[PDB]
Tab-separated table of N, CA and C and ligand atoms in Angstrom:
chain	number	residue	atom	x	y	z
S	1	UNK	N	0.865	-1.227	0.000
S	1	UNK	CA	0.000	0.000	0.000
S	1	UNK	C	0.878	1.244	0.000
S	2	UNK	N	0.137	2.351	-0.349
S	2	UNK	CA	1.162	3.700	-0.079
S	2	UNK	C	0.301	4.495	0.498
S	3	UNK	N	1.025	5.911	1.380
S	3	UNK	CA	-0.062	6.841	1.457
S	3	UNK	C	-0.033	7.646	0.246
S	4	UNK	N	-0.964	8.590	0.231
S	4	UNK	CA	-1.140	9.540	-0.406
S	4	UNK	C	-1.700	10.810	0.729
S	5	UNK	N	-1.832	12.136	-0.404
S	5	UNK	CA	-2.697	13.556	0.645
S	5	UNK	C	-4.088	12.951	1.062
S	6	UNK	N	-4.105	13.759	2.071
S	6	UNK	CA	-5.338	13.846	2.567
S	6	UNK	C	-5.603	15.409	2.581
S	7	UNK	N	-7.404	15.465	3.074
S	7	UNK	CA	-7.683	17.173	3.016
S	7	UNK	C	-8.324	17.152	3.980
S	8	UNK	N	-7.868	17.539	5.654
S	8	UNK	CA	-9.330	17.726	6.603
S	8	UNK	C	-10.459	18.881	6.607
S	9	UNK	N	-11.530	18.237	6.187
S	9	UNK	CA	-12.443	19.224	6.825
S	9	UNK	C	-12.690	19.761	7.740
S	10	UNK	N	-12.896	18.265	8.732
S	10	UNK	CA	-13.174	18.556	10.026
S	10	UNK	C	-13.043	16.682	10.768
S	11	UNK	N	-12.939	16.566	11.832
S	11	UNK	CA	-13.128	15.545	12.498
S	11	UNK	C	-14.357	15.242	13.565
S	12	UNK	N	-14.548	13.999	13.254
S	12	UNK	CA	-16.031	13.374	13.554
S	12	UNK	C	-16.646	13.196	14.945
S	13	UNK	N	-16.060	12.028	14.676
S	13	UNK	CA	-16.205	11.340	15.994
S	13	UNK	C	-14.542	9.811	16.167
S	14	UNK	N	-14.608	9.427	17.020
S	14	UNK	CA	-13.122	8.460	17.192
S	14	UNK	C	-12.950	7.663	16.006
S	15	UNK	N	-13.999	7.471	15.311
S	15	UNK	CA	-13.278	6.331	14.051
S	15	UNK	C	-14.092	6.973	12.799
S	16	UNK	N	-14.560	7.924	12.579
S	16	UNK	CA	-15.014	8.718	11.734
S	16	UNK	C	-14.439	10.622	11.481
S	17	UNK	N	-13.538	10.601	10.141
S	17	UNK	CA	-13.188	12.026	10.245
S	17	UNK	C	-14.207	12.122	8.361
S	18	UNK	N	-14.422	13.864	8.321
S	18	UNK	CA	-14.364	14.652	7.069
S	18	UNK	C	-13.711	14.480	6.329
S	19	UNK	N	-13.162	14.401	5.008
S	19	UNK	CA	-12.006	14.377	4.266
S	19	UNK	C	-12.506	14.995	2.852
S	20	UNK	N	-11.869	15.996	2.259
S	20	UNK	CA	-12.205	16.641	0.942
S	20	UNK	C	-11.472	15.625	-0.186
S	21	UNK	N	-12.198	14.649	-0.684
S	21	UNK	CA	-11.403	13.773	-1.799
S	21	UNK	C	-11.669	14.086	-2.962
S	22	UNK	N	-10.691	14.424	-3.885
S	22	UNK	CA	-11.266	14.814	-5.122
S	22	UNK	C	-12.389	15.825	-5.243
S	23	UNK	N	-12.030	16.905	-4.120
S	23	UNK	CA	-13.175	18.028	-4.156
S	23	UNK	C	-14.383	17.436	-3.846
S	24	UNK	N	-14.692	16.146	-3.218
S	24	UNK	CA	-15.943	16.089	-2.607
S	24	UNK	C	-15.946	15.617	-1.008
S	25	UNK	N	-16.640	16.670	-0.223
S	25	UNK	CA	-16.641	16.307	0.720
S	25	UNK	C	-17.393	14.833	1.439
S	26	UNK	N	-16.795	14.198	1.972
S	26	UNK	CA	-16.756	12.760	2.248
S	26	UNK	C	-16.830	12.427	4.309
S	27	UNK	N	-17.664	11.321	4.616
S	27	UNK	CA	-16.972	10.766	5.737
S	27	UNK	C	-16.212	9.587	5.572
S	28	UNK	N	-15.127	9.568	5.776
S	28	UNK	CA	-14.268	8.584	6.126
S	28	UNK	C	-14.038	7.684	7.221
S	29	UNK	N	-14.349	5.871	7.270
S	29	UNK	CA	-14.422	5.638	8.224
S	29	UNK	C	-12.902	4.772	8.461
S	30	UNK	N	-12.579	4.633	9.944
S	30	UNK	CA	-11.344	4.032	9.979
S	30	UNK	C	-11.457	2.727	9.784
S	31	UNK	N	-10.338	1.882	8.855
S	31	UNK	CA	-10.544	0.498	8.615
S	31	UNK	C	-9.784	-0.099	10.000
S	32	UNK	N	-10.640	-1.484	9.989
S	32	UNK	CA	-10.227	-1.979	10.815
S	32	UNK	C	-9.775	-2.176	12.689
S	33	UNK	N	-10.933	-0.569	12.987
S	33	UNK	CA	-11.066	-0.696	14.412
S	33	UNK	C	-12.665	0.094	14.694
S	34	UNK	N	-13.286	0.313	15.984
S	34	UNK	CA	-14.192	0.304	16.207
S	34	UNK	C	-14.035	1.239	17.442
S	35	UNK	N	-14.340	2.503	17.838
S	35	UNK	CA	-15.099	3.029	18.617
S	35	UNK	C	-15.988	3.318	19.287
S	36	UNK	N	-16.160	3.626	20.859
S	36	UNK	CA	-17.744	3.767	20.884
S	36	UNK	C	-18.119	4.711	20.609
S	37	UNK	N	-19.430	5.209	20.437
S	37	UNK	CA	-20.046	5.794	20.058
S	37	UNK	C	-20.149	7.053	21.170
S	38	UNK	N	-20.496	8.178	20.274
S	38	UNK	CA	-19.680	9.756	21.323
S	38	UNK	C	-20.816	9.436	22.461
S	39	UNK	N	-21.681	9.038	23.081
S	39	UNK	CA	-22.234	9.398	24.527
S	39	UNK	C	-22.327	7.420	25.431
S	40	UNK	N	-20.981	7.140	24.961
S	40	UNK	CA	-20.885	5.783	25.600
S	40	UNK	C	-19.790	6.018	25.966
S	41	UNK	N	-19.136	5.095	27.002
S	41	UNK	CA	-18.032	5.112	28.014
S	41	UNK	C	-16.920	5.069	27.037
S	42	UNK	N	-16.216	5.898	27.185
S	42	UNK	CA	-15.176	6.178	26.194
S	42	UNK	C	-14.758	6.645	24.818
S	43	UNK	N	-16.173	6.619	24.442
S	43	UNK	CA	-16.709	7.958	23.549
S	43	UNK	C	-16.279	9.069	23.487
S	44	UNK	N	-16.694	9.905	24.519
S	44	UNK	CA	-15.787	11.286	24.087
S	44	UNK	C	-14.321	11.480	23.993
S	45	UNK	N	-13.993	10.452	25.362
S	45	UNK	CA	-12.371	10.776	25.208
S	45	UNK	C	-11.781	10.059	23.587
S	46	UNK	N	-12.412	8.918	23.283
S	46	UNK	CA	-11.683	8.450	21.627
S	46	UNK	C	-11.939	9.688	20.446
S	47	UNK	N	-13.530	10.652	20.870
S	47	UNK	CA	-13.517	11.679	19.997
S	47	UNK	C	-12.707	12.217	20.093
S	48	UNK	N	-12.126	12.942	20.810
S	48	UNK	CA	-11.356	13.640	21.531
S	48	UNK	C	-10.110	13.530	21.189
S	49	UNK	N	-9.443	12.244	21.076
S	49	UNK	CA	-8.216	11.697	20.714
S	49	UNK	C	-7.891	11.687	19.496
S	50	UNK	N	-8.883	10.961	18.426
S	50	UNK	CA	-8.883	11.284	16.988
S	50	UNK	C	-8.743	12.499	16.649
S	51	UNK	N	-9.592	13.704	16.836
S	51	UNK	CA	-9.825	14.999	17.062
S	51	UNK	C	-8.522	15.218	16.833
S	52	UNK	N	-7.994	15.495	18.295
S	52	UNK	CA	-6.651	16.052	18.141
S	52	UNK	C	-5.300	15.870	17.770
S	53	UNK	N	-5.826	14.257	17.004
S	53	UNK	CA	-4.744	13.739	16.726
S	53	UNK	C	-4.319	14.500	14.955
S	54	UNK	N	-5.441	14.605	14.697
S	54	UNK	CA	-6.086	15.052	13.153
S	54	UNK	C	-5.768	16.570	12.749
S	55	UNK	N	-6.178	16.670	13.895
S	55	UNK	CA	-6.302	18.850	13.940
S	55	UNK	C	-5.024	19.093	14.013
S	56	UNK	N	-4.213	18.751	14.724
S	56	UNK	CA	-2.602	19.532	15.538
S	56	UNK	C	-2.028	18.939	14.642
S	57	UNK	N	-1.527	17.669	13.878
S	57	UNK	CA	-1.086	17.612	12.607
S	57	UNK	C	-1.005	18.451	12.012
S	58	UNK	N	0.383	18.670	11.304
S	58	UNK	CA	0.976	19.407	10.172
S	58	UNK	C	0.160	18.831	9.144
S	59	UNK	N	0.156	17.503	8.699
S	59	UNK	CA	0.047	16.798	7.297
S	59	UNK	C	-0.572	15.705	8.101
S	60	UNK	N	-2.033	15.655	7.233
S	60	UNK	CA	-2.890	14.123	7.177
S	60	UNK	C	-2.458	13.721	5.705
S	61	UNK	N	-2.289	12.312	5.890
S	61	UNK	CA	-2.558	11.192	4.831
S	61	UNK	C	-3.572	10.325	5.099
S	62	UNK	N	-3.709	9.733	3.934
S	62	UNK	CA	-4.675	8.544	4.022
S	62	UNK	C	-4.375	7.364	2.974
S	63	UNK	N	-4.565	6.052	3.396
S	63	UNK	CA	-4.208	4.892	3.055
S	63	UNK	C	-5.238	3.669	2.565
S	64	UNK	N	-5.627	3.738	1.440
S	64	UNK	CA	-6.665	2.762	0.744
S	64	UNK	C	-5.752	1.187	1.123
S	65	UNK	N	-6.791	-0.219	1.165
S	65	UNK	CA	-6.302	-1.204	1.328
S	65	UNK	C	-6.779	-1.675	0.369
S	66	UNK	N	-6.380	-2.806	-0.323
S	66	UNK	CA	-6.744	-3.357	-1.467
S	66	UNK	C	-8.064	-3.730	-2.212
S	67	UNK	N	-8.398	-3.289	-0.922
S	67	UNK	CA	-10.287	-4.330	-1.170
S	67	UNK	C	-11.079	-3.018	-1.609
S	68	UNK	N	-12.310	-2.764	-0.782
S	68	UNK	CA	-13.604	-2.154	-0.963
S	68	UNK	C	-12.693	-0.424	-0.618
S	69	UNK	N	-13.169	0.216	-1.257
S	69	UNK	CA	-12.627	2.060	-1.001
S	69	UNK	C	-13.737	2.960	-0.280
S	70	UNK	N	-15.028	2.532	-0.891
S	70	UNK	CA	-16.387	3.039	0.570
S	70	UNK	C	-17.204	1.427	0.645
S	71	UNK	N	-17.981	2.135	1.405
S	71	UNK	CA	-18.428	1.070	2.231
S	71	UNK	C	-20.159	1.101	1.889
S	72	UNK	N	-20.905	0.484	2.686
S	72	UNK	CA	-22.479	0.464	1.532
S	72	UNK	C	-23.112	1.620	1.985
S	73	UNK	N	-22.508	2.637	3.137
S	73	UNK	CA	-23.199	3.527	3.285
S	73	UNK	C	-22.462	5.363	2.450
S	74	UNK	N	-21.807	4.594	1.529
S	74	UNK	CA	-20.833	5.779	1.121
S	74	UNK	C	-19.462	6.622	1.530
S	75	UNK	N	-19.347	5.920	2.422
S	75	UNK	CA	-17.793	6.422	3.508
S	75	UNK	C	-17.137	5.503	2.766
S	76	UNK	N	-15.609	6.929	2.684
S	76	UNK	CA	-14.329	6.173	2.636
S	76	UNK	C	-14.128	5.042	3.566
S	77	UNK	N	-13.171	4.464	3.022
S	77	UNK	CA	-12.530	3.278	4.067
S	77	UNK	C	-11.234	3.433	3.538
S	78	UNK	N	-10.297	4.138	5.050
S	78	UNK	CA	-8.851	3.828	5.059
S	78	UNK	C	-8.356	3.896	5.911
S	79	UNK	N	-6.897	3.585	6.261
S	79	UNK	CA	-6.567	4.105	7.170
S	79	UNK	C	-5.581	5.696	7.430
S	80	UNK	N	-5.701	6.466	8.273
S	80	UNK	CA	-5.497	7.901	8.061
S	80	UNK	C	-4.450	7.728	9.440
S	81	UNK	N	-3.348	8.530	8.880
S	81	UNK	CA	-1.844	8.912	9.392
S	81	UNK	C	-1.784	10.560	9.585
S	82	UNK	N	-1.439	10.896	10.867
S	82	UNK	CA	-1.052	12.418	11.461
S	82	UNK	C	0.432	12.169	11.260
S	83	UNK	N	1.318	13.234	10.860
S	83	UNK	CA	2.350	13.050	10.606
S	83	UNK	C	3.217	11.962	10.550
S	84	UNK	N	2.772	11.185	9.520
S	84	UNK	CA	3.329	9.785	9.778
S	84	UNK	C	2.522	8.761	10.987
S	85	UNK	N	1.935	8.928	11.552
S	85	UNK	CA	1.628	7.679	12.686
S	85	UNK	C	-0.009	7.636	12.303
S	86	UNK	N	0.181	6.489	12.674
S	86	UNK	CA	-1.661	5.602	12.088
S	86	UNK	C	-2.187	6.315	13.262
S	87	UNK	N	-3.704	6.696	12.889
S	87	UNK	CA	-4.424	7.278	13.648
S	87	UNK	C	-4.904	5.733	14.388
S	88	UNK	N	-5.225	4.692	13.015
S	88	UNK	CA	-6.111	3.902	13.464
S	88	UNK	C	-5.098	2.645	14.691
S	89	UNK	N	-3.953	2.619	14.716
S	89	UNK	CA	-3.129	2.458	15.620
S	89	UNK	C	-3.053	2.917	16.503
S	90	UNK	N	-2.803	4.527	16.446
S	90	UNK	CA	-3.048	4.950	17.927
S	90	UNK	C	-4.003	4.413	18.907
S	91	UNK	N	-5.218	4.477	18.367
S	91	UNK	CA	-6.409	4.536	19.727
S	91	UNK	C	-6.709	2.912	19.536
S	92	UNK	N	-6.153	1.987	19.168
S	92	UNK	CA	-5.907	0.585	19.701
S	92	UNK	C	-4.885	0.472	20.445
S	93	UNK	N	-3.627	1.512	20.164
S	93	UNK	CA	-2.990	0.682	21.240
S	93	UNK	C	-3.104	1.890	22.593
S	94	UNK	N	-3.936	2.694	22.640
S	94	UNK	CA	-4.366	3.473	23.801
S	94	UNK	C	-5.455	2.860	24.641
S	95	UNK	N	-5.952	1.814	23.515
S	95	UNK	CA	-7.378	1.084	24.591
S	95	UNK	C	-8.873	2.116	24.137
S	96	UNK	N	-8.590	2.727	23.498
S	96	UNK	CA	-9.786	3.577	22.925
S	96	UNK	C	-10.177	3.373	21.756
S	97	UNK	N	-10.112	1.921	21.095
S	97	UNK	CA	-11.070	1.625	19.910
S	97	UNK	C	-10.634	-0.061	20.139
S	98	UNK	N	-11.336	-1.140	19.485
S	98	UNK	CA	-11.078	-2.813	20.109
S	98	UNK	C	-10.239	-2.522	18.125
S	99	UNK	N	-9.820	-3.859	17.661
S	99	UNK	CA	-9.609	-4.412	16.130
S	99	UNK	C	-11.206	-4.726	15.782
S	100	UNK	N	-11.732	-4.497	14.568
S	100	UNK	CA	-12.890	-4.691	14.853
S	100	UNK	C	-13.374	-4.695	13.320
S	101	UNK	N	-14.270	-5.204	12.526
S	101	UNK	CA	-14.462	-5.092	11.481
S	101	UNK	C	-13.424	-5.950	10.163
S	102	UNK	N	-13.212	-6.581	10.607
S	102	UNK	CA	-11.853	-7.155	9.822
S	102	UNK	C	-11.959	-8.328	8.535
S	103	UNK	N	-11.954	-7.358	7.614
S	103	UNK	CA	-12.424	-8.331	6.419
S	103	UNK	C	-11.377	-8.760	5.293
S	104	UNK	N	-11.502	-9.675	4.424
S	104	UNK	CA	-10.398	-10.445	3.771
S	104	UNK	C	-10.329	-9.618	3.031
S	105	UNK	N	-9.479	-8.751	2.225
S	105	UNK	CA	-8.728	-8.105	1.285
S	105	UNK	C	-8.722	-6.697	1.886
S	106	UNK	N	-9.004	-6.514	2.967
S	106	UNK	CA	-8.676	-4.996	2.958
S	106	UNK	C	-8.291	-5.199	4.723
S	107	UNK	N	-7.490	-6.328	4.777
S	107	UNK	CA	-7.182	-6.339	6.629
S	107	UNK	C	-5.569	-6.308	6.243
S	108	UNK	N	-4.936	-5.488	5.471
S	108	UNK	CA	-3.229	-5.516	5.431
S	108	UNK	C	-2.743	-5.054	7.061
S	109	UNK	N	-3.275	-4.308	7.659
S	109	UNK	CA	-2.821	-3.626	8.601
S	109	UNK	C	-3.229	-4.619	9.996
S	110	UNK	N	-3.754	-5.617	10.066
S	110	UNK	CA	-4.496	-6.735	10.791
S	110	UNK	C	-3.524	-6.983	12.073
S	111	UNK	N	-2.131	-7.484	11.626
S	111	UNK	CA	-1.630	-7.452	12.590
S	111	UNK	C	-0.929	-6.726	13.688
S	112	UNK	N	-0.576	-5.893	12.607
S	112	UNK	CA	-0.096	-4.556	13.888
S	112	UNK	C	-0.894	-4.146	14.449
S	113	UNK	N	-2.355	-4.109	14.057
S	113	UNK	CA	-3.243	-3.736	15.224
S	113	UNK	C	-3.237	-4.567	16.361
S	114	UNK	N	-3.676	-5.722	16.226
S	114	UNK	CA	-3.712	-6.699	16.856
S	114	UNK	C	-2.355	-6.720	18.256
S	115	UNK	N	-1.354	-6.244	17.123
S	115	UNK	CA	-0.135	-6.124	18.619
S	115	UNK	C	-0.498	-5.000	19.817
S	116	UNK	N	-0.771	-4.184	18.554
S	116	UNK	CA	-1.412	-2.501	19.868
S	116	UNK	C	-2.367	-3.311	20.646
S	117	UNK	N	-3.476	-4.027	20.736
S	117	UNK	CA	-4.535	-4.415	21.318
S	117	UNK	C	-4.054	-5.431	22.268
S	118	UNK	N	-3.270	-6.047	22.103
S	118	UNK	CA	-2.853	-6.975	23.562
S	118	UNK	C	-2.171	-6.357	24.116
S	119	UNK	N	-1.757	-5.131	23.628
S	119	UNK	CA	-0.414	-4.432	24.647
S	119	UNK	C	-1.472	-3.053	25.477
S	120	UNK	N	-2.736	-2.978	25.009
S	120	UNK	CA	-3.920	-2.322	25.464
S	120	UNK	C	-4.085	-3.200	26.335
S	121	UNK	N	-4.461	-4.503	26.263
S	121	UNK	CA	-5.142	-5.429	27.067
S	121	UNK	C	-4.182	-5.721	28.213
S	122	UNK	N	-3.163	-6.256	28.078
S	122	UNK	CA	-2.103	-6.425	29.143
S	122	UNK	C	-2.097	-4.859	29.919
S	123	UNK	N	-1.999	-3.527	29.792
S	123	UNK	CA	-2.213	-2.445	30.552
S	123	UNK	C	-3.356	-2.453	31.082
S	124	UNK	N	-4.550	-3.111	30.756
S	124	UNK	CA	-5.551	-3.034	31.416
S	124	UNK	C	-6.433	-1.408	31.039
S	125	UNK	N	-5.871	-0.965	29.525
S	125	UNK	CA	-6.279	0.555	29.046
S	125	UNK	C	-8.076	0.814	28.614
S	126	UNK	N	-8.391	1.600	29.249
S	126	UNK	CA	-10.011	2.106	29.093
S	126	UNK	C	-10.504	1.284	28.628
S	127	UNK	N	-10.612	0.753	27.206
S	127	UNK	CA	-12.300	-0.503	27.034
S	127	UNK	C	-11.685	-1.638	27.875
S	128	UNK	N	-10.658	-1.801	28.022
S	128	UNK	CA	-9.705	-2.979	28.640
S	128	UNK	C	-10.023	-3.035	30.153
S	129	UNK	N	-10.324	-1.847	30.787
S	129	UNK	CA	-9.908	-1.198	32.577
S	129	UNK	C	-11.033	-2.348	33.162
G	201	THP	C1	-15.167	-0.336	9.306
G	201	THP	C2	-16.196	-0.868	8.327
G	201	THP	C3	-17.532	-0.809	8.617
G	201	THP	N1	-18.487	-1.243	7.672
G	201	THP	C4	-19.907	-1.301	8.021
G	201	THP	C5	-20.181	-2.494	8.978
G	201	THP	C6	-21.395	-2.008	9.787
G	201	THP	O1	-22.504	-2.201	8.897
G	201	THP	P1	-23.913	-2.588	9.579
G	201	THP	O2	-24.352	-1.217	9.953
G	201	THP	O3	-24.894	-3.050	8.411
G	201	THP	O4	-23.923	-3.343	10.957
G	201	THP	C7	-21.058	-0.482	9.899
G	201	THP	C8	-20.311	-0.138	11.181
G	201	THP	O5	-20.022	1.279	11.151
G	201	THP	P2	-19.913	2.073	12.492
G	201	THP	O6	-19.026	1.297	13.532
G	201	THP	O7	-19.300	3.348	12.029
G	201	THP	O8	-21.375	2.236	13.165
G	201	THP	O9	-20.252	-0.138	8.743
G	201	THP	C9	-18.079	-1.775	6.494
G	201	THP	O10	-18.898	-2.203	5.662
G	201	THP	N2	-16.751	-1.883	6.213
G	201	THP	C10	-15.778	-1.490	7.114
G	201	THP	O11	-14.585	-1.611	6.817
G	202	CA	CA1	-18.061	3.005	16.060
């Protein structure tokens, strides 16, 4: 895979940001992990985290996986990098999103999540606590 630009609009919620692709504004969802939802236990703080992980970045990218590019409700599917570091990495291995959604041709990134998430789980981190 490679990255390429990204364009923020704005950021969502923990596994959902804005993204201007090809001049159309878009939601983008993160492949391959799962957040809760903004008024469930750990909700705001994963908004929160994505958020600022997105905003205070110099440079977003974003990363198509081989398979499906949106999804059946019209969202991108990728994974999105703040100066170089996976967003969708971060908040697995913070304990603020599980691996989740994981489907055959578009799970390249499968295992490194998977490492963040036992090293969440062994800390005992927020969905983990
Ligand atoms: C992350 C992801 C979600 N989806 C679908 C699965 C779920 O569909 P169903 O709604 O039919 O259960 C939904 C979960 O999105 P959210 O976690 O954003 O609610 O989006 C994909 O189709 N591909 C993906 O890669
Ligand atoms: Ca979610």
């Amino acid at each position: 895979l490679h990255k390429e630009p990204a364009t923020l609009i704005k950021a969502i919620d923990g596994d959902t940001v804005k993204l201007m692709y090809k001049g159309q504004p878009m939601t983008f969802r993160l492949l391959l992990v799962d957040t809760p939802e903004f008024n469930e236990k750990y909700g705001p703080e994963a908004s929160a985290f994505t958020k600022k992980m997105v905003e205070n970045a110099k440079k977003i990218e974003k990363e198509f996986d081989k398979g499906q590019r949106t999804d059946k409700y019209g969202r991108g599917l990728a994974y999105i990098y703040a100066d170089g570091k996976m967003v969708n990495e971060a908040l697995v291995r913070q304990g603020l999103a599980k691996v989740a959604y994981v489907y055959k041709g578009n799970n390249t990134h499968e295992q490194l999540l998977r490492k963040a998430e036992a090293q969440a789980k062994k800390e005992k981190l927020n969905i983990w606590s």
